Structure formats: structure tokens, C-alpha cells
Write a protein that binds this ligand. Structure first.
Ligand SMILES: Nc1ncnc2c1ncn2[C@@H]1O[C@H](COP(=O)(O)OP(=O)(O)OP(=O)(O)O)[C@@H](O)[C@H]1O
Ligand SMILES: Nc1ncnc2c1ncn2[C@@H]1O[C@H](COP(=O)(O)OP(=O)(O)OP(=O)(O)O)[C@@H](O)[C@H]1O
Ligand SMILES: [Mg+2]
Ligand SMILES: [Mg+2]
Lengths: 131, 321, 247, 359, 122, 72, 120, 73, 72
């Protein structure tokens, strides 16, 4: 009746229920999907995944990876992913503040690699707590 | 005093019951770590389905991805996955026997070994000797998730993408058998675009080929057997489109593939720890059985000699009056 | 004990019968001789018994024998003091004994009657020069099957049956079929349970456990061997259950 | 049945009328309290209790009679008493004096209970006379007659036939062991003579399990023939589920690292031991014992913390005593846990659990 | 030691002290074989309190001043009941175990623990 | 055990070694207990150090006695 | 065994053998149940040296040549003190433990250690 | 040599003629058997066996005497 | 044990059963750490499966001795 979608982390598969509308961020920036979408292999950004099924629509933050799509099937391989409701809302924004100071104290390449990668992991974690 | 001899048997009989339930708790945990790998089995099956086909589609010498990028090996990091708790075989000792021999080998090559310690039994060994360079101590864990692994992946990623460290290698205990499982060393970084995963010695398995551990029974005992499973790689559709670039998609796939070799190394070192403990609690509960038997025999000798010596004092006094 | 024995050897010698003697129990024969000897003022032996314990027991036990006329076989209960088998009261008793039948409180909780432990009961008679090779080969296979199942009960509680090997999927199913087929209805319980008892000969016992261990009866259910006598009566209860389940 | 008022005895180690049961343990374990609370329970039953106290302190004989006179126990009780100041002949003949009084009522068709407050001190008082009479000794300097002392005493206490009138004499001899040496000479004799043994351990008395019955080692040779039909139904589940908890005592430290089939058994068995805990001189009626074991062995206490399992059952026993008095008439008259009363008890539980959760 | 004689405040803490020390008596075998790390955090807590109860049961005597080397202490029952209510509740879980050794009052155990914190710096 | 105690000593020895018996007895409890824990804190690790130095004070060669001066 | 009689070199090594075998005597309740695997780095080294001391204490006898067939060895005290100097100084820690079993000198323990390491 | 016929004695714990050798073990471990099979092996040799059964089952001695008759010992 | 070991046996038994006594000295140590090692190499897996069938030499049936020619 539609496309089915699976979002699978390196130990746990999160989604396996049929939905009609997703809109994934990517390294380009934004891609909308409806069924009968031509098979395409993209890379996915460390950001939110807004999903619209029948009545209610919700966002599951994912921490970047690979999204290929086929004959009405979207497998998304992402190295960490959390649902946007199952993150508690303010508590991510405390952890965002733990990252925002940690880039101010970032020095050298490896602390500017690690903070800025984890900041964007954390800054796109709070944006699911509000969405 | 026979009361002291009855208390020794009642505590060894207590020790036999504790070290046998610790065997079955460890028997439940290696089976629960068997299940945890097969949950992550659809991820790495699909990741290798991609990574074999992106190296197929690419065919370009201009494509260099910085997790596959080969530099000169002047420095080398080594992440060692130890246990968190004791009472598990010679598990953490033979591991640090193997870490010492790799520290030794890189001094013959003279190329500045570096340690990443995971687990409380390595945190201790590495902190205790300060004349060894260690970057970061990690909390080891039972039930490792992407989140604990991601942090390990980050230290591994950020230490390599800058040119301070080449060839992040790793040694851990692959779970081969229950009583004997030697720690073998792998070279994690630099990743091969092929995705072949190979040990430091120089044997590389094709990555579509990896084996799960399944704990079952042989004749009477509980054994584990590693059955090698081949995943067939289908062909990426001819009509398929790429979003950014075949070099920019591959630059997002290899953090997924580096996160997966870390998490599978944690979960095979976890089952090796919990089966070294099951082997240790099996040998302890059978040494305590052999002890309890010879304490029950040595008690009855002392019990019978006490009664024989007690009456012969009384029958001597009954005649002497 | 002697008074009971003198009646038992009238039926042996004069009526030429085969008698059962029952001493319940043989330890209270020992402690009653230990009490008389202490009252008679005898200097006691090791561990407080009478100094004549080896002969007081030997006087009772050497009259219990098979003559050319008949035999008397005595099945005598044995109490082990202080759970010490090296104590002079069991050690003098066990020298004269020829088989031990261990009854089990744990096997009675499962419902098996008679609740004889198969693995802790012993005999000196289960030697292949005595019972023959066809009986000795089968009693060792039954013991090895029941000992392997006793080891696997912790593994079935961890793995379950579907994860065990195929060789050991059978030695659970066969051993669960042996534990049922060891049970038996009795004639003395026909008022208590209603089910009629079965006298099962040695010929039908060996042919019974040959079929369970050769794997021919792996199609039958488990609860077709519970409280049946013969191995033909096993398949009869099974074919009844296939005709009772379809209704 | 002989209802002692303890759940740990009257469910799992049941003493019947005409049975010689042994209360045994080391000193200061609760042996007298098991025997005293049994006498205090039969205020409504028409048994006659004889409390024989051999070789005790005179101050503790006066405290037992003070305990008996307050609770109305002396209207059906004789206390035979030979204080340790008395000669050894009087201590040797004191349970034979108590057994002769209990045989009077038993032959007059009346049911009786007799308690010997330590058979250990009688054996020492006959060893005293025998060694002074120059009689040759045995193990622990006892004569050969010390078995024949106690077997001549305890076999006088059993259940009579309908041709005599069915009087009973339920003996509860108390024997004190020494550092738990069950294989000592006087414990070895009386365990052979007696049907059942009630093993009391000081490692359970200090841990809070009170009365400190070691129900695993304790046996009863009469078995379930003592119990009433209401008690046979419910205590068939208490015996199995405390045996499943006995195999899993090593696993209680490791409750998390287990499946739900095992962890619920650890959760159930830790509340089934809270059923067994009674304070001193608070015996329960048989109807109160069936409520407590039906509630615990059928899942109706798994929601509670262990601090509250004691407080819940006291409030549920006083609930059905007042609000639902039709339950007690089903068990007193029919003496069977009927499908009517199983419905009536469950209505009391879900109304008490609602009132106990609010609190 | 019955609640009809001493009240239920004395009696409920006299049971909880004996339950704690019985629990620690059962564990000394397996902490000798398997160590303190194998215990649950409930069992490491009842071990650590029974270490502190056993020290606090000790007391300097007026007659034993030539053996203890420290002056003796008369301890009232209310000071005894108040002190063991603090060790069992867990409000004294931060003090070292030697703070409770040969003290009279529970005010003497805490004031000994302040001296052990100062001399740790010295 | 000495049943006379520090009455059998001079004032100088009583001032110094007046508590040494009960300190080593309480140390020998905690040294046997310190083998049962892997990672132990500093207030134990200090007392394990001081207790093993108080044991080393007490060792002597045969018939080489220490004067009470040398003992204090 | 007093230094004014046996000498000071002999007495300080008879102490160190007995301090080693006492410490390994105390450890045989820990290694009886858990085994060698839970011992510390120092207690494993005392177990390793005392396991080599116990076998070098053994000796073939002239009288026992009809039981075993191996010839007996007279071992002088100058050979005995220097043979236990080497185990306690640790200079023979690399040798196997069976090299020390039923040999006269510590040189024969060295020559036996070769054949156990040579034969493949 | 005095040959017992049991390979484990005659190769590894060999009994000579004139030797006192103890047959020691727990009950029902084949002690009478090692003694009996030693007597059965003395058929060819000029060795006179003497079997003393002290305090045993008369049924057990009668089996041994019949086993000697059956095998010409 | 036997006090006259080699003096009793004949020269066929002294020659042949001398290799028997040294193999069971080897196989007693090899049955130890057999399940500990569990990776039996051919310097051990031969010498163990030899040693199991050395026991099968030693099994005799009851009331059936073997002559000295048959033992050697
Ligand atoms: N169920 C119980 N709950 C709490 N305390 C109890 C219980 N039963 C007995 N006690 C207490 O335990 C103490 C010892 O009990 P009891 O006097 O019955 O011991 P005993 O076995 O007769 O020992 P002894 O023979 O040495 O006097 C008494 O002070 C009593 O109050
Ligand atoms: N070499 C053998 N091969 C087969 N069966 C044997 C052998 N030796 C003994 N048996 C059997 O073992 C049983 C015990 O042996 P035997 O009675 O000789 O030993 P025992 O120690 O003298 O017994 P007991 O102590 O009861 O007199 C006997 O029934 C015998 O049939
Ligand atoms: Mg009493
Ligand atoms: Mg014999």
C-alpha cells in the first residue's frame, strides 16, 4: 500500500513499520520521499528524520550514515539514532551546554574534530526534543 | 574441636553453591551476548552489501577517503579491550601478556606504541605504570551499545584523521572456545576500501565473510562453535542514483563501518570474559567439590576417634574405682 | 531379627519355598546389641559398639542364604548414622550386602512410582558374567543415558532443547522416556489409584529398553510410558492417545 | 490435626493428634516458645496440655505459669515441675509423672498434648543415678537404658482406637543439641524414637526468621494425614514453592541477571518466608493460616515491599475476621477450601489491597 | 530483650543490629574466596555497616585503661540507642571504620573522624 | 595477653606503646580484609603502610637485646 | 641451624628457603579453590620459585637405584648452598620446573633443562 | 618371580617368590579377584597355594571353592 | 609399590615393561592439563591416545590370567 522503512543501528533496529512520508536530511541538506521513488543511494547527515505516517507525524534524530532507497523500501544505516519523543526535552539542552563550552575550550585539531562532531551530534539532538 | 570442622564443611558447601550459580549466571550471560550479536547481524550484513558495491561502482584513482588514507607509520595506537571484573580465568593476564609483546615488537621497530585502555582491569594496568603513553581511559561495559562504542569510535576517529597517529590496531579476545581463547590483534585503521578486515600478522578475511559464535552442546559438555557465514552481495540497480558523490557517500559509510568493528570487538571480548569466568567458576566449584569430600572424610575420622577416645577414658575410670 | 529369621527358614527348609525376609531396620538390631553389651558390662569397641558386632551381625546374616532346598532373600533397611558410611554399623552391614536400593524423595515429587533412584542404586549382580551380556549392555546404556540427562538439566534451563545438538536432542527425549518407563503400576495400589498393577518379567524389561534406546519408539509421546508395564502396553497407550486426541 | 498456631509447623511440618514430634535445636532458639504457643493455641480446642519442666530454673517455671495464667491457658493445663535443685530421682520421674496424668484423660476419651521441657535433662538425671549406682556406662557415660528410658516414655503417647474411645496423647519432647550436633547420643536416640523433628536454628533466629524453624531439614512422618482438607489444598503449593526457593538461594544475589521464570520465583519465595514469621505468643487460627498461604502462594503479595508484607497480612486477617465472617464458617464446618470460599477470599484481598495502597 | 520490657524502639534496633551482623557472618566466607567486588551494592552496604557496628560495640573501660591506653567511657542506654540508629540508617556512611573504634558516644565517633580527616592532611 | 598491662611498664613506654597492642590487633584485622578488595582508598592504604612499619619495628636477632632507651 | 654454627652464608639461605615455602604453604587454600589465576604478581612469583625449590629438595639415592634405576648423587653442602642461591636470586627462573626434579647439583638441573628445551 | 597373570602386577608391581605383598583397597574393588587369579595362574608352576578366608560370607567362600574345582586349581 | 621390583621379573619383563613404566609416568602428567589446553598437538595428542590404549592393555577379565609370553 506504500513504502516500508527500516532504520537500523549497529546493534538495534528502530523502525520497521510502513510509513507514507519521510523527509531526511543529508549532506545535500533536505530530501522529501513519497512512494514509487526511484532507487537512489545517498549519505545521510547527522540530523533529524521527520516521518509522516497516516495521522500523527514524528521525528527520530539519527547520527548520520547511509540511506539507500529501492522499490518502495528505505533502509537507513545510521551509527546511532534516538526517537525525537523518547529523548526527554530539556535534558538534551543541558548536554548541549556541556558541548558548547567544550568547543570554547577546544584546542588542537583532535579536540576541534571531536567537539565539533559531538556538538553537531548534540545540537541536532535538542532539535528533536522540540520537534 | 569438631564444631570448627563442621563449619569448614558448611562454608565449602556454601562456596560450592555460590561458584556453581556464578557458572550459570555466566552461562546465561554468554547466551545473552550470543543474542546481542545476532541483533546487530542485519546491520553489518547490509553495510557490507553497500560497501562491496561502492568499491565496485567507484573505479577511480582520484578517490581518497581519509579513513582509508595511508600515511607513514611513525606512531601507532593500540586499543586493548579488557575485563571490568576479576575472577575470570587468565583472561585479563594473557591479554596484557599479549599487549606487552606488542609494546615489545613496536620497540624493535622503534615506532612509538600508544595505548587506549578499555575496561577496569586495563585501566588499572595502564595507569599503574606511568612510563607508557595512553591517550584516554574508557569505562568498559557489559551490554555495549552504539553510545558506548561511539565514544570509542570518536577517540579512534579524531586521533587518526589528524596525522599524529597512523595504523590504529587493536587486540582483543575473539571468542573461539570456552577454556582457550587466545587474544588476537587486528588492524582497525586504516580501513580498507574493499572492507577486508585483517590481522596484524597478515591474514585478511573477506568482509562478506564473518562468523557468529553459537554456544551449543557436544557429547556431554557445553561447547561453542563458530560457523562461518557467507552473505551474498546483490547487484546495485543500474538505474540507481547517487546523491552527493561516490567519494562523499563513502566518507559517510566508513564511520558506520568503523563503529561496527568496534562494537563487534566489544561483544566478542565480552563473551570471552564471561566464558573465561564460566570456566573459572566451573573449576572452582569442582575443586570445592573435591575439597568438601575429603573434608567430610577427615571429619568422620576425627568424629569417630573422638568417641572412641571419650569412652576409653570413661571405661578406664569405671574400672579404676 | 532372629525370631523373624527362624520363621523364614522354616519355609526355606521344610516347605522348600523362596522366602523374603525383611529387617526394618538392621541398624536397630545393631544398637540393641550395643545396649545389651553395655548393660552386661562389656568393654566397648570402636565408636561405642559392642565388641561382638562383627559376629552378632554375622550370626544373623549367614543364616540368610540359598540352600539346595530353597532360599531366603532378605531386603533389609539400613540407617547410616551421622551420614557416615565408614561407621562400624554400616561398614559391618555393607560387607554382607549384595545390592543397595536407594529410594528418592526427589523422584517421588516427579510422580515416579516406585521411587527407586536408578543412578544411585547398585548391585554386585550387574556383571556380564552373571546377568549376561544382553542385560549388562543395556543397563549401562540406560545409566549412561540417565547420567547424561542429569548433566544437561542446567543446559536446558539456559539454552532450551532447540539449541542442543541433534545427538543430545535424542538423549533428552529418550531419557525422559526411560524415566517414565521405569515407573510401574502395583497390585497393592489397585485400591489407592484404581489402575491395575503389572508384573513385568526380566524378559520383557530388556526388550522394553532395547526399543527405547534403539530409537524405534521416538514417534510415541512421552506420556505413553508412564505407569505401563510392558513395552507393548506402551504402544497401546500411545495409539489410544492418538485415538483420544482426534476426537 | 494438632493446631500449634505456627504457619511453619501447621502447614509444612504438620503435627497430628497421637503423634510424637520432636522440637529440637540449640539453646535460646525458641524451643520453649514453640511448645508454649502450642499450649496457648488450644484455648478453644478441648485438649488438655501437660507442661513438664525437667531440671529448669525455678524462675522460668514461674514465668511460664505467669504466661499461662494471663492468657487463660491454665484452665486446661497441668504444669509438672522439677527445678534443678531437686534430686535426680525426681527429675528422672517427672515426665513419667506427667505422662501418667496425660494417660488419665486419654483413657477418659479426652485428647491431650504433653510437652517435656528437655528430655536432655532427664537423660542427664538418669545418667547421674546410674553412675552413682555403679552401672556400666556407654557413649557419653550414659547407660544402655537411655534409649529404653525415652522409648518407654514416648511410646505411651499415641492415638487410641474407637474400641477404647479415641483419646490421644500428642507428645512434643524438646531436646537441646550442642553446637548443632544432631549425631550426639541423646539427639540420636530421640530422633529415632520420634515421628517428626522440628529443627530450630540460631542462624535463622538471628536473621529474623522467627520462629526459627529450619523447614528443609525438619520432617514429619505422619505427613499430610494430619492436616485438614482445607490445609492440604493450600499447603501443597507452599511446600513446592519454598523448595524452589531453596534451590535458588545462591541466585538471590544475582536476581537481575536472570530470566523472568526464575526471578519471579526469587520474588515469590522471599514473600513466602514473610508468611512464616510470627511474633512470640501470637498463634494463628486455622482459618487465618489458610488466608495467609492462599494470599502468598497465589500471587497476591508480589506487589509489596518486604517491610509491608507483615503489615498487610495483619490488616487482611483482621479484615476477614470482621467484614467477611462467612469465610470462617466454611472452614470450621466443612474443613475444605471450597470454591465458594476461594471466591469469598479473593473479594477480601482486592478490597484490602485497595485500602492498603491508599493508607 | 522483648518489646513488653524495653519498648519497641530499643527492640527494633536490637534486631536490626543482629540481622546485620548475622548477614555479615554469612558473607565472610565468600568475601574471603571471591572478594568484596562480587557482592551486590545491597550486600556491600550491609557489610560496610557491620564493619562499623562491630567497631562501635567496642568501648574503653575505666578498668581497662592499662590495656586500651585511652580513658574509659560510661555510655548510657539512650546514647547507645541513638548511636546505633545512626549507623543503621546510613547517615554515617562517610566516616572511616576506625572512627567508631573505642569511642563512648556517637558524638565521640564523629569527633574522632574529624581528627582523622585533619591528620590525613598532615 | 598481659594481664597487668601498662602498670608493668615505665612512664616513657606507657606514653608511647600504650596503644600499640590494640592498634596492631585492629590493623591485622584490616590487612586480612584488604586482600578482599581490589581498589581500596587512601585512609586504608595509609593504615596498611603504618601497620607494616609497626611490624618491622618488632623483629630482633637472638640474644641481641634492646635497652629500654632503645625500645622507647 | 644457627649462624654461629652453620655460617652466615648457610643460615641466611636456609631462612629464605623456609620463608618461601611458608608463603606457598599459606597460599594453598587460595589456589586450592580458585587456582593460580587469581594470585597477585608477587604471590605468583613466590609460588613459582617455591614450586622449583620443592623439586630441587628431592634427590636420587644410591640405595634407591633398584627402585628407579637412576643413579644416586652425593651432594655436598657447598653445592647445596649455591644451588639454592640460584633459585632465590631468580637466575634460573626461565628453566622448567621438571628440570629440578631428581638431579644432584644445580648443574644437572641446568643440563636437564636443556634436554627438556631441546627435544622436539 | 611369582606370576599373577594380571598384567598390571606382573609388569609394574611384580611379586617375587618369598615376598609379602599387600592387596589393599575398599570393599568390592576386586581384592578377592586378584588373590583368586593369582592362585589360578599357578597351574603349571610347582607352587602350592593356600587360601585363608577369615570371617567372610560362606556363600562367598563356596563360590571360590567351586571356581577352583571348575578350573582345576 | 614393590620392594623387589626388578629382581623379581624375568629378563623379557625387565626389558619390555621398562618402557611401560615410563609411559604411564608421562601419561599421568598428560591427563593433567588435557582439558585445560584443549588444543592437543601431535606431541601430546599422540601420547595421550597412546596412553588410553595402554590402559586397554591392562584390563583383564575376571578368572582369566595371562601367561608370561602373552604379557610380554
Ligand atoms: N517467634 C519469636 N519471635 C521473637 N522472639 C522469640 C520468638 N520465639 C522465642 N523468642 C524469644 O527468644 C528467646 C529464647 O526463646 P525460648 O526461651 O523459647 O528459648 P529456648 O529454646 O527455651 O532456649 P533455652 O532452652 O536455652 O531456654 C526468648 O527470650 C523468647 O522471648
Ligand atoms: N578383573 C575383573 N573383571 C571383571 N569383573 C571383576 C574383576 N574383578 C572382580 N570382578 C567382579 O567384581 C566384584 C567384586 O569383586 P570381589 O568380590 O572379588 O572383591 P572384594 O573386594 O573381595 O569384595 P568384598 O570386599 O565384598 O569381599 C565381583 O562380583 C566380581 O565378579
Ligand atoms: Mg527451654
Ligand atoms: Mg571378598
Amino acid at each position: 500500500m506504500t513504502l516500508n522503512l527500516c532504520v537500523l543501528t549497529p546493534n538495534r533496529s528502530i523502525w520497521n513499520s510502513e510509513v507514507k512520508e519521510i523527509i531526511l536530511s543529508t549532506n545535500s541538506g533536505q530530501i522529501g520521499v513519497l512512494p514509487n521513488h526511484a532507487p537512489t543511494a545517498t549519505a545521510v547527515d547527522i540530523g533529524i528524520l521527520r516521518i509522516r505516517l497516516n495521522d500523527q507525524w514524528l521525528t527520530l534524530a539519527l547520527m548520520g550514515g547511509f540511506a539507500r532507497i529501492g522499490n518502495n523500501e528505505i533502509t537507513i544505516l545510521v551509527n546511532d539514532a534516538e526517537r525525537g519523543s523518547d529523548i526527554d526535552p530539556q535534558e538534551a539542552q543541558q548536554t548541549l551546554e556541556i558541548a558548547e563550552a567544550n568547543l570554547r575550550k577546544a584546542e588542537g585539531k583532535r579536540q576541534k574534530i571531536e567537539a565539533n562532531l559531538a556538538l553537531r551530534r548534540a545540537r541536532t539532538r535538542v532539535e528533536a526534543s522540540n520537534t | 574441636n569438631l564444631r570448627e570442622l563442621r563449619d569448614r564443611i558448611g562454608s565449602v558447601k556454601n562456596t560450592q553453591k555460590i561458584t556453581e550459580a556464578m557458572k550459570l549466571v555466566a552461562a546465561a550471560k554468554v547466551r545473552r551476548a550470543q543474542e546481542a550479536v545476532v541483533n546487530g547481524r542485519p546491520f553489518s550484513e547490509t553495510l557490507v552489501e553497500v560497501l562491496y558495491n561502492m568499491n565496485e561502482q567507484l573505479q577511480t584513482e582520484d578517490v581518497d577517503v581519509p579513513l582509508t588514507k595511508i600515511r607513514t607509520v611513525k606512531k601507532v595506537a593500540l586499543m586493548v579491550v579488557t575485563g571490568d571484573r576479576g575472577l575470570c580465568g587468565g583472561f585479563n593476564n594473557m591479554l596484557l601478556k599479549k599487549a606487552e609483546s606488542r609494546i615489545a615488537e613496536l620497540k624493535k621497530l622503534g615506532v612509538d606504541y600508544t595505548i587506549i585502555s578499555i575496561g577496569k582491569k586495563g585501566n588499572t594496568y595502564f595507569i599503574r605504570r606511568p612510563e607508557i603513553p595512553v591517550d584516554r581511559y574508557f569505562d568498559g561495559t557489559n551490554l555495549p551499545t552504539a553510545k558506548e562504542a561511539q565514544a570509542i569510535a570518536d577517540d579512534v576517529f579524531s586521533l587518526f584523521v589528524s596525522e599524529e597517529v597512523d595504523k590504529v590496531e587493536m587486540l582483543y579476545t575473539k571468542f573461539v572456545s570456552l577454556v582457550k581463547s587466545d587474544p588476537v590483534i587486528h588492524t582497525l585503521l586504516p580501513l580498507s576500501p574493499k572492507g577486508e578486515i585483517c590481522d596484524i600478522n597478515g591474514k585478511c578475511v573477506d568482509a562478506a565473510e564473518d562468523e557468529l559464535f553459537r554456544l551449543t552442546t557436544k557429547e556431554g559438555k557445553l561447547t561453542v562453535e563458530r560457523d562461518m557465514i557467507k552473505t551474498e552481495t546483490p547487484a546495485f540497480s543500474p538505474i540507481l542514483e547517487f546523491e552527493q558523490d561516490p567519494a562523499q557517500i563513502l566518507d559517510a559509510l566508513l564511520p558506520l563501518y568503523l563503529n561496527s568493528q568496534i562494537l563487534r570487538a566489544l561483544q566478542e571480548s565480552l563473551a570471552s570474559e564471561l566464558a573465561a569466568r564460566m570456566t573459572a567458576m566451573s573449576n572452582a566449584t569442582d575443586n570445592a567439590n573435591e575439597l568438601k569430600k575429603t573434608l567430610s572424610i577427615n571429619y568422620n575420622r576425627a568424629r569417630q576417634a573422638k568417641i572412641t577416645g571419650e569412652i576409653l577414658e570413661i571405661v578406664a575410670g569405671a574400672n579404676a574405682c | 531379627g532372629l525370631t523373624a529369621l527362624t520363621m523364614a527358614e522354616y519355609f526355606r527348609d521344610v516347605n522348600e519355598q523362596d522366602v523374603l525376609l525383611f529387617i526394618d531396620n538392621i541398624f536397630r538390631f545393631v544398637q540393641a546389641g550395643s545396649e545389651v553389651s553395655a548393660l552386661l558390662g562389656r568393654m566397648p569397641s570402636a565408636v561405642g559398639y559392642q565388641p561382638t558386632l562383627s559376629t552378632e551381625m554375622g550370626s544373623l546374616q549367614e543364616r540368610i542364604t540359598s540352600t539346595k532346598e530353597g532360599s531366603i532373600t532378605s531386603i533389609q533397611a539400613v540407617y547410616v548414622p551421622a551420614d557416615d558410611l565408614t561407621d562400624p554399623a554400616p561398614a559391618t552391614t555393607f560387607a554382607h550386602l549384595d545390592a543397595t536400593t536407594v529410594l528418592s524423595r526427589g523422584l517421588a515429587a516427579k510422580g515416579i512410582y516406585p521411587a527407586v533412584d536408578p543412578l544411585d542404586s547398585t548391585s554386585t549382580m550387574l556383571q556380564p558374567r552373571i546377568v549376561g551380556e544382553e542385560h549388562y549392555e543395556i543397563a549401562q546404556r540406560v545409566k549412561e543415558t540417565l547420567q547424561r540427562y542429569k548433566e544437561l538439566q542446567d543446559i536446558i534451563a539456559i539454552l532450551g532443547l532447540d539449541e542442543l545438538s541433534e545427538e543430545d536432542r535424542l538423549t533428552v527425549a529418550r531419557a525422559r522416556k526411560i524415566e517414565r518407563f521405569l515407573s510401574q503400576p502395583f497390585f497393592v495400589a489397585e485400591v489407592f489409584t484404581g489402575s491395575p498393577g503389572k508384573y513385568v518379567g526380566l524378559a520383557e524389561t530388556i526388550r522394553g529398553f532395547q526399543l527405547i534406546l534403539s530409537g524405534e519408539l521416538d514417534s510415541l509421546p512421552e506420556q505413553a510410558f508412564y505407569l505401563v508395564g510392558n513395552i507393548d502396553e506402551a504402544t497401546a497407550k500411545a495409539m489410544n492417545l492418538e485415538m483420544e486426541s482426534k476426537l | 490435626p494438632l493446631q500449634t498456631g505456627l504457619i511453619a509447623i501447621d502447614a509444612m511440618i504438620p503435627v497430628g493428634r497421637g503423634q510424637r514430634e520432636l522440637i529440637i535445636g540449640d539453646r535460646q532458639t525458641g524451643k520453649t516458645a514453640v511448645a508454649t504457643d502450642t499450649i496457648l493455641n488450644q484455648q478453644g480446642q478441648n485438649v488438655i496440655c501437660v507442661y513438664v519442666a525437667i531440671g529448669q530454673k525455678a524462675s522460668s517455671v514461674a514465668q511460664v505459669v505467669t504466661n499461662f495464667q494471663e492468657r487463660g491457658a491454665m484452665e486446661y493445663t497441668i504444669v509438672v515441675a522439677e527445678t534443678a535443685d531437686s534430686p535426680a530421682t525426681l527429675q528422672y520421674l517427672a515426665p513419667y509423672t506427667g505422662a501418667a496424668l496425660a494417660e488419665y484423660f486419654m483413657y477418659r476419651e479426652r485428647h491431650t498434648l504433653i510437652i517435656y521441657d528437655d528430655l536432655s535433662k532427664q537423660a542427664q538425671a538418669y545418667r547421674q543415678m546410674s553412675l552413682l549406682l555403679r552401672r556400666p556406662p556407654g557413649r557419653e557415660a550414659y547407660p544402655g537404658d537411655v534409649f529404653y528410658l525415652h522409648s518407654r516414655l514416648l511410646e505411651r503417647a499415641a492415638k487410641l482406637s474407637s474400641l477404647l474411645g479415641e483419646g490421644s496423647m500428642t507428645a512434643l519432647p524438646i531436646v537441646e543439641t550442642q553446637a548443632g550436633d544432631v549425631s550426639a547420643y541423646i539427639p540420636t536416640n530421640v530422633i529415632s524414637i520420634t515421628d517428626g523433628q522440628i529443627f530450630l536454628s540460631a542462624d535463622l533466629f538471628n536473621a529474623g526468621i522467627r520462629p526459627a524453624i529450619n523447614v528443609g531439614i525438619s520432617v514429619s512422618r505422619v505427613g499430610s494425614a494430619a492436616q485438614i482438607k482445607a490445609m492440604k489444598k493450600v499447603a501443597g503449593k507452599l511446600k513446592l514453592e519454598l523448595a524452589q526457593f531453596a534451590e535458588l538461594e545462591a541466585f538471590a544475589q544475582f536476581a537481575s541477571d536472570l530470566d523472568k521464570a526464575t526471578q519471579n520465583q526469587l520474588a515469590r519465595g522471599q514473600r513466602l518466608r514473610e508468611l512464616l514469621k510470627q511474633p512470640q505468643s501470637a498463634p494463628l487460627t486455622v482459618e487465618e493460616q489458610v488466608m495467609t498461604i492462599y494470599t502468598g502462594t497465589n500471587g497476591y503479595l508480589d506487589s509489596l515491599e518486604l517491610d509491608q508484607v507483615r503489615k498487610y497480612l495483619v490488616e487482611l486477617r483482621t479484615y476477614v475476621k470482621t467484614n467477611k465472617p462467612e469465610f470462617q464458617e466454611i472452614i470450621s464446618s466443612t474443613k475444605t477450601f471450597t470454591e465458594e470460599a476461594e471466591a469469598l477470599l479473593k473479594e477480601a484481598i482486592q478490597e484490602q489491597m485497595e485500602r492498603f495502597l491508599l493508607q
